Design a protein around this ligand. Sequence first.
Ligand SMILES: NS(O)(O)c1ccc(-n2cc(COc3ccccc3)nn2)cc1
Ligand SMILES: [Zn+2]
Length: 258
Amino acid sequence: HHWGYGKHNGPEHWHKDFPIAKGERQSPVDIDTHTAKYDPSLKPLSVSYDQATSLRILNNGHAFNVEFDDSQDKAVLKGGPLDGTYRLIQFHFHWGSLDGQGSEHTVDKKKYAAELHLVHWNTKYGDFGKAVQQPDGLAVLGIFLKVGSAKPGLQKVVDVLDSIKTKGKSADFTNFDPRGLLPESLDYWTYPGSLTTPPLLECVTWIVLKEPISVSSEQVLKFRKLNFNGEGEPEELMVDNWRPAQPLKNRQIKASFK
Ligand SMILES: NS(O)(O)c1ccc(-n2cc(COc3ccccc3)nn2)cc1
Ligand SMILES: [Zn+2]
């Protein structure tokens, strides 16, 4: 009886195995745009993905991860609220069964169709496993998806999903350029939070871009054909793999923009 996104194992049950689920800096949160304060001391984000080396795509039973070679400073995130250098390890998405839900963060209570998470770890801690034990161990760049025009840079991801339909399946996924998933603007909100799945560790500086990317209905429909289950098991579509907004508690969300 493992955690997931069903009625008997979903987000409202996670606290039983992971008591930090009710902690002081849990994610995601609702971003109240009128309460978020412009912080003129925040720097522009530095997203340096030109040397990114993608390796593999994996259905882990909760989402799919596009994994990168993080054994050198290839693809890194710096600046903004961050001190030091954060190395890209993987990206994944959360999405809904319908276009009106799917994102983890919300903006004035608005839910987007999906949310992209580019996960980075602070290189002062040496490895990802050590980084997640630190309050400034990870930086996750979150990007909202809305349904409209297709995102050309997403299609290579979409087209490999048939080969990783079920939990535990992976496929080679080299030479994928994550720069093709970014919006035009790097304006962002930032706050201290957590992993949004178990183990829910409070180790993340969240950087959530204001500008969503547009993906087509056909692209998101292919996300929704994935399976939570393993091969040869009863089919359960991988949809609604998002955690709802958690209490903000003693936190302030800062904006990089006026
Ligand atoms: N959705 S998210 O907040 O971007 C998010 C990002 C990453 C994770 N996540 C969970 C795990 C699995 O937990 C680990 C704990 C210690 C060392 C290694 C792995 N590894 N990564 C969970 C959620
Ligand atoms: Zn995520």
